[PDB]
Design goal:
Blueprint lengths: L14 H33 L2
Subcellular location: Cell membrane
Protein name: Erythropoietin receptor
Family: Belongs to the type I cytokine receptor family. Type 1 subfamily.
Length: about 50
């Protein structure tokens, strides 16, 4: 409720939260990659019905 994380402390820095962020980052990258693929596919479909 005040962005206490900006203090950086062990009371939060846990392995669970770390792994969680990692998975989130991986998903964010996967979504983007899939988005670019869809766009590229569309461009091809247009010039190649």
């Amino acid at each position: 409720m005040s962005e206490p994380v900006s203090l950086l402390t062990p009371s939060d820095l846990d392995p669970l939260i770390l792994t969680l962020s990692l998975i989130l980052v991986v998903i964010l990258v996967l979504l983007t990659v899939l988005a670019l693929l869809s766009h590229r596919r569309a461009l091809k479909q247009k010039i190649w019905p």
